[model samples]
Target chain A: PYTVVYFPVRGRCAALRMLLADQGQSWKEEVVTVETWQEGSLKASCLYGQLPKFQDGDLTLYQSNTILRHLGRTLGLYGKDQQEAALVDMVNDGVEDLRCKYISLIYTNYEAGKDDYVKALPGQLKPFETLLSQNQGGKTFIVGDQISFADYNLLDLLLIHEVLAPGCLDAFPLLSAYVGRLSARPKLKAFLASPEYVNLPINGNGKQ
Target chain B: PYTVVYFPVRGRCAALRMLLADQGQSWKEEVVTVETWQEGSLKASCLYGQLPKFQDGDLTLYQSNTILRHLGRTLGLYGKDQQEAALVDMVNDGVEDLRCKYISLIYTNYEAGKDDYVKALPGQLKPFETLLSQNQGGKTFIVGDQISFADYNLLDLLLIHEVLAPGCLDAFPLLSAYVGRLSARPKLKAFLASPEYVNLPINGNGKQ
Candidate 1:
């Protein structure tokens, strides 16, 4: 019931589809080609004036985090309470640091200092590892055994990392394990493979 | 009683304070010094490893917008309904866009042309201009007749524009007038004048 306008590549819009797929919700994924974006004034029309804008009936939403929060609330996936939800967002922030730095390094400044860059990521990953272990409590999900926005976010981020920056999983065994575990789930698996789902270039990791 | 740990600047934590100011409630603002941030492991020690982290009794939280939403739910300043809240967020998103790009232009790279750099801000402002004229039923406040987080966001943003880039606001007269009008509020004027608020070079927008 929503039209998600984005580029064909996972790029910025992957998280939204990941959430929708996690919810088993049906929404239109409208990919924008460079031509379409130029001809349609597509990018400027969205609230954030960027891709990954969602339009549902008269409702239009932007800001990936804001949209994710809405979906989390609407679908009951954010967390058990406000504190928990905040925790989920906190975890996602780590994902952001990873993605922003990782992609820029791989794409823009390719070659040289990669080993150090790779080495530095584990220190960052440690917190998530601890949180995931704690959140499990012997349960599967990050927030109280239920699938959380944080989980799907982490999963998508991991898939991107694994594909784009191969060996990104070396340090954080927990998150590395988490990617496999989450991707193997029926809901997430279907979403990843859905015709609507589009993959993008990873640093060196190929499509799994 | 919440303890807000952030830099003295209004860059990130200002929105949460804006929420409190709108509610006429106050909290402790613990300013973190450069040395403190460097010497301390604030990020990793905190939940998200980010500042603007709010601690309410036993529950500490991160994510500025999430904290704002929590305060919104608590203060009843969120909106009359869900739709209205979404609109508030949309406006906030616009401010976020301005905050991210505009601030980057001022502080990070004034000369860096991201294409949409300044070319894109005008359109973003017009939505607010039109909305400010029509949305509040002619009330001076941004959201409802009463003040909401949107006003604080606008004030902080306008203050940034005024101090950092004076000409950025030319596209939205309503917003300019609104800033002029709101800055005259007794409490806001007092706060602006108070020692509690310190105006910095705004990242890099100065004669430095």
Candidate 2:
């Protein structure tokens, strides 16, 4: 059995949740509220003092990427081969770089940094657009024909960015189409519409 | 052929360089001087406008961890098996979390943040100690019986942190020994002593 413990917000764990739902994997969710997190003991027990702790049978894992990669490895979603796997990792890393910037803007500088973040958004997103351009005319998945773990992560990142800056992807036809195609998957689509995803705040502080 | 393009500093690519040296792998370094980088084309050409760009054969990769994992996968440094691989990722992720704090302190907040960073250093390092305690009385590698890629990266992280805060590992006997043991490996030892590693500033700004 697999279990995921994270905050009520769909912050770090959203991508993994979408992966599980889309892939027909079932896992128990232990939602951690701000109050529960503030209690100290649970926070103290966490290895790195962060949420989105994961458990699979006797194996326990911390760090969102570790859990995502674990599921990718176990479920055969990494890639077709070693090269493709490397590409998957590269794409995921790009998503993470932008994700870090988005997180900083949202949590610390939403009011003060919004203009600069939005202004620089195009340059940040162009790599993905170019990546898609080089591969199969942007029709298939990010790295390869089959969907990898990174696709779920990238989808979450792009989706959240759209919320932050409306029409942010308008200039990038490839990414706009990529999001629509990925989001339209039946399982992921339903999951996105569910209260599990929709009801929670995008961030802990009620921003976005 | 492997080619690494990065600044002269050991900033991000140090671990991978150390890994290749320690593993008896050969590669070329296409050093990116600040002045040349400012020439504009190369900076714009980089996918995310960062250094430590790596090329293996015809495939070019960005992002330090992506490059590390690729080498890990190809060179058999990830782990012995599926479960061990996940553990390796977890360890690497923890190293990164702390590395971020250290980088922020060095680059942005050195003067003002040093006191608080050192103050919180012990708590930040406790997880690795606890991990070591639970595994084979801290006599061996981090994740499993075999050395993994995460070991090298973690070693670099620890090594740099020591430079920042000397004797930081004194209280943790296991980590202290781990650092000493890894540092003494013949190839890595010589590499650490060479001008390539010795002459370059640790950071671009000549801090530490």
Candidate 3:
């Protein structure tokens, strides 16, 4: 079976887990501990010196977001055709861009030479709110009237807020509601509650 | 006859133009003058907005990188297959991330709240130097032996030293040499010399 060697905590790995759960796909979560990460295949196995890896068959990949996207496309969760896939890609990249900003604020507020932690919140959340509100159209999902990587990604971004900067959501009601809707899914909720799944604290408490 | 609209500058839009030219595809580059952009797209004329818009038959799409990748796939320039295409995506995205960080160090450091710019260069540049060095395979181009969009991208990245950060080349020797080699390519060199190609000073000249 393919294994994802990552810390039990959510962090980057959480996004992939949420996607897998949202899609109802079966895969083994090879949880990594801090000590384990310092040795063996989890450490000496490959380059890229990072965690949250995906090992499938003989194919091993790093970069959690890329892996999430690869699975999204392979599982036919992105869309049925190339054009639709492209749109999924656009939205994914767009949201990914926003996530980078949010993470930067979280990780680099005062320590990383960042002057304003939450300054980018309004502009960042507005376009997404607009996009989500436009695509809502009475559907709970963010893209194509069904659960997608985008929806799970939305959930994870909300998780960042929950952990890093909860106040950022104060100005974005639609997005906050969207996250609630995504988290409310039965499978997703179950996945969150599972023993294999661990809640990742926002800020720097993600090592657990 | 699709029209690719972008600012006269070649910031993010260069790859799209390069892809089109590589395919021998014909299109119009609608350069917006300072007057046109300031009071132009936002004013009453055929359309209202900045450039970097794409026109395909009856459809007009924004976002230049999206246009570039889409054109890359359609013209068989991205890669030979799906997996390779994804690699192309990863490499392109990786290069973009690196260059964006580099540029952030150059231009948007203060406005974007990015101080410690010079001090923070090593972390990002080291990987790129290693990437450009190790992946060379002692060859001239970046991917597949022939010039793909990745080559053009790496070439453009090298130009950042010349265009924006002049002394950056001194730090990464392999990347410096690689950029030197790419800059001397006959076709790319010719294109760079053409009037259709415009140059702008990198340090916040406010030329748009």
Candidate 4:
């Protein structure tokens, strides 16, 4: 059994949720309402004063990527070898870099900055496209033949970006196809369509 | 047998540099001059358009933490077990979150933000101290008895913070001692003092 502590938004938890669903693992969500977070006790206790704190049995972990990597390690979804694993990390870190920019735009300057952000989206996304092109001819996963944890994170990132800038992936053919293939996984497809994901806002501030 | 492609600064490469020196590994630095970066060939080739691109044999990787984790995995500095590796990741992610703030302050708003930033430093730093106190009374390395890649990253973070706010660690005895202990590692101390590290600016913008 596992537990995820975070606010009731898709935000950073979406990728891990996708990962768990695709991997057939079950976890509980301990939702932290805005009022509870503002009260400061739970925030004070978090290692980084952040959310998406995860618990696997007795072990507690913070940071969304950390939780994903933990699950990746334990669930055998990391990679087939050390080299592939490093590439997976490289891909995930790139996702995090872009995700940070996406978060800033959504939460801080959605109205004013959206245009510039969308304009630069192609350059920001081209690396992933190139990466896919080089790996297995962009036919399979991000790193290797089997799906690594980074794929879930990348899939969530791509999906959210489409919400932000419609038709964004049309230019990046590999990425476009990669998203469709990954999202079509039986359990992941069901989760994406479920009310649990559909009803929740992508971000907490109602911008997205 | 390692190559580091980064801008000529201590920035994100400090930890991996420290790791290599402390581990007695030889490496080559492929410095990216600003003029060359502006020319757009190498920068365009970088996977994420970011520095700290690392090469280990035939495998090329980008992202600072990914490089750290790769070295951690190949060099046996990750952790002894899965649980400890997760905790190592947790610590490194906290360091990165703070490092991001530190970078933003230095590069974007130093004059106007220094006071508030220093005031909030303790709150940002307490979690690490608390983590140390909870783990082996803060006497040894961060996650477990053995040094992990996270320790190198954390030591660099703490050192730079001290430069930012002198005596910032005075309130946290465990962290203060932890810094002293890690800094005095024979080879790391040498690397810290060498002109290669000492002469380079901490940030590219001449702040700190």
Top DockQ hit: 4
Residue A27 in model 3: lDDT: 86
Residue-wise C-alpha lDDT for candidate 1, range A34-131, written one tens digit per residue: 78887867765664457668776777776665566667767888777766766776666666557666666766565765667667766656667777
Which tens-of-lDDT digit does each residue in A23-61 have in candidate 4?
999989899999999999998878888898899999989
Q: What are the TM-scores, per candidate, against the unseen true structure?
A: 0.84, 0.98, 0.76, 0.99
Predicted candidate 2 versus true structure: per-residue lDDT over B1-208, tens digit per residue: 8999999988889999999999999999999887998899898888788878999999999999999999999999999888999999999988887888888888998999898998999999889988888889788988887877898988998889899899999989999999998899999999999999999888888776
What RMSD, rounded to one decimal, does every model reach?
3.8, 1.0, 5.1, 0.9
How well is each residue in B1-208 modelled by candidate 1, as lDDT tens digits? 8778777677777666655754567788787877887876775686556677787777777767667666766677667766666667667767766776665566666666534564665675666776787766434767666666767786787776665446778767778878877777776767666666656333423421
- Tens digits of lDDT, candidate 4, B111-167: 999999999999999989988988899999999989999999999999999999999
Query: DockQ of every model listed?
Result: 0.39, 0.85, 0.21, 0.90
Model 3: lDDT of residue B177:
80
- Which CAPRI category fits model 3? incorrect
Worst 10 residues of 3 chain B by lDDT: B41-50
The deviation in Å at residue A55 for candidate 1 is 1.9
Global CA lDDT computed for model 3: 0.62
The alpha-carbon lDDT assigned to residue A74 of candidate 3 equals 69
lDDT of 3 by residue, A1-208 (tens): 4578777566677777887876777888776776777666556544345666787677666666667766775676776555555455555656676677766655655455333545655655565565566665524556566555666776787666555555677677777777777777888888887766654553344311
Instruction: Please identify which of the two predictions, 1 or 2, would achieve the higher TM-score against the true structure.
Output: 2
Task: Return the interface RMSD of model 4.
Answer: 0.6
